[PDB]
Write a protein that binds this ligand. Structure first.
Ligand SMILES: NC(=O)c1ccc[n+]([C@H]2O[C@H](COP(=O)([O-])OP(=O)(O)OC[C@H]3O[C@@H](n4cnc5c(N)ncnc54)[C@H](O)[C@@H]3O)[C@@H](O)[C@H]2O)c1
Ligand SMILES: [Mg+2]
Ligand SMILES: [Mg+2]
Length: 335
């Protein structure tokens, strides 16, 4: 059901953040060691969430409070959540946005993000790490892109930053539509990114800024190559897609993890379901594990639904009940 997919999406995102952060802090990022310690996930709420979930919650609470996108409300919810708990693991640059939004003199909630990094904007993955709720609030693809972009621009004004958020939101949107081949899923995403990155003002800006042409489209094409490739190794995935804090080096990677893990992996025991396998695999890539896993888990959770959210894993996660209530509320309000 759509309710099951809404609940699965937000639970999967929470699992990716909580389980990913557990392994990141224990310096356990290779597959054998992840599998060795799955018992630590208790197969009380022992796994803390990070800034990924803190911002995801604030984004969803803003949409529910206004039953619409309100940039002032959402920006203030982000800044107030930072002020309440600044120690969740926020990016070093984005804290400047929050501090500016907390200034009473601030008159334009989008200006701080535009001023980041000498006026070029952040390219980090923070706009995408929190975006899944957009695709629960907005069922139409045009609205998904519109509000993924706007919500990301509150902190991430560069096209790499906000187009990464759009791509992640589109992947969650597509996953909510149910069963698909990997090929069809990837082709749909590629078609949307080609439209967005082929736009005249966009490819001109990529020219004057020295960037490469159609960056996300190129990486989605690389994903299709990897999905057809024999004996793909972690080193090839990381070398070709990245595992970094930049949206460009993490959003495609998360999507690859979802697509690859739609099929069994001989290196991951078959006792794990498809959502679990996706999370385990994503964490084994290392790098920015909490954000790659939160994004892969949001897509996988929307796709597989609550039936694949293991109670023992879910109940180990800080705030899993509030996360589930928010998912059900989004369904009641917007569906
Ligand atoms: N293991 C990790 O990498 C790790 C662990 C905890 C938290 N984080 C945090 O870092 C990631 C990104 O967060 P965010 O995008 O909200 O924070 P952000 O401050 O907007 O960007 C994060 C970092 O990327 C760099 N950066 C981004 N844009 C530019 C630019 N235009 N020029 C030069 N450098 C730039 C810079 O080092 C900045 O601090 C998230 O995963 C967040 O959780 C990362
Ligand atoms: Mg984090
Ligand atoms: Mg992170």
């Amino acid at each position: 059901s759509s309710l099951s997919r809404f609940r699965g999406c937000l639970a999967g995102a929470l699992l990716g953040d909580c389980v990913g952060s557990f392994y990141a802090a224990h310096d356990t990022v290779d597959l054998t060691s992840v599998l060795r310690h799955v018992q630590s996930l208790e197969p009380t709420e022992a796994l803390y969430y990070t800034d990924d979930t803190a911002m995801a919650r604030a984004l969803v609470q803003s949409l529910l409070a206004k039953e619409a996108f309100d940039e002032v409300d959402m920006a203030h919810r982000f800044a107030q959540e930072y002020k309440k708990d600044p120690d969740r693991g926020y990016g070093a640059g984005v804290v400047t946005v929050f501090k500016k939004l907390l200034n009473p003199k601030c008159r334009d909630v989008f200006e701080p993000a535009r001023a980041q990094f000498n006026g070029k904007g952040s390219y980090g993955n923070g706009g995408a790490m929190r975006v899944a709720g957009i695709s629960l609030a907005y069922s139409s693809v045009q609205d998904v892109q519109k509000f993924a972009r706007l919500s990301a621009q509150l902190t991430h004004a560069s096209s790499l930053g906000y187009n990464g958020a759009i791509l992640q939101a589109l992947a969650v949107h597509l996953a909510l539509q149910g069963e698909s081949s990997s090929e069809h899923f990837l082709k749909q995403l590629l078609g949307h990114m080609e439209d967005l990155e082929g736009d005249a003002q966009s490819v001109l800006d990529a020219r004057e800024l020295g960037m490469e042409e159609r960056p996300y489209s190129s990486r989605l094409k690389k994903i299709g190559e990897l999905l057809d490739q024999a004996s793909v190794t972690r080193e090839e995935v990381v070398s070709e897609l990245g595992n970094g804090i930049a949206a460009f080096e993490s959003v495609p990677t998360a999507i690859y993890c979802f697509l690859r893990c739609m099929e069994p992996d001989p290196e991951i025991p078959s006792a794990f379901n498809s959502l679990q396998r996706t999370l385990i695999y994503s964490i084994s890539l290392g790098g920015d594990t909490d954000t790659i896993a939160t994004m892969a888990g949001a897509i996988a959770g929307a796709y597989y639904g609550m039936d694949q959210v293991p109670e023992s894993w879910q109940q180990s996660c800080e705030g899993y009940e509030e996360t589930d209530i928010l998912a059900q509320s989004l369904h009641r309000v917007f569906q």
